[PDB]
């Protein structure tokens with residue numbers, strides 16, 4: 364099946380807890396995969412304009428590890444719940460992808476999660492301005508704009524709204540698209 368095939372692909376790239384005990388400032392992100400209309404999608408958030416860091420920008424759910432978290436996957440799930448109302452029973456964490464080093468002292472660990480088909484986002488408006496899906500295949504043929512660094516522009520055909528996706532968020536989206544969609548018969 365589509366989902367069993369995606370999970371099997373993802374597991375081959377799992378680094379697990381290899382880098383998890385290193386003494387960094389630690390954040391986790393959830394790369395949430397949603398199956399709709401017979402295709403896989405990634406779920407993104409638009410950060411509230413009220414936030415200090417990166418107001419109005421597109422990013423994955425997640426946040427800073429806190430002492431309650433059993434592990435880095437727990438960070439991602441706790442923060443996703445706070446931000447978009449995703450409950451742990453609504454997500455199957457499939458793997459941990461390559462962590463992202465930033466600012467010399469920070470390590471961001473991405474987890475890919477399969478999201479229940481009945482999930483409907485309940486965003487905290489203090490943190491999240493918007494939630495939207497992008498088909499995973501978009502990231503194989505994105506609409507690229509140069510700002511010099513590459514920015515993706517995705518227009519939702521449901522409503523004509525264009526979102527800019529860039530940086531780590533764009534990079535991770537492409538990675539997941541490659542992992543899951545490469546070398547597939549039609």
Ligand SMILES: O=C(Cc1cccc(O)c1)Nc1cccc(Cl)c1
Pocket residue numbers: 390391392408409410411414422423424425426427446471490491531532
């Ligand atoms: O903070 C994150 C995870 C995260 C961490 C580090 C970098 C990055 O792009 C995303 N995500 C989020 C998304 C919406 C609102 C709020 Cl309040 C936070």
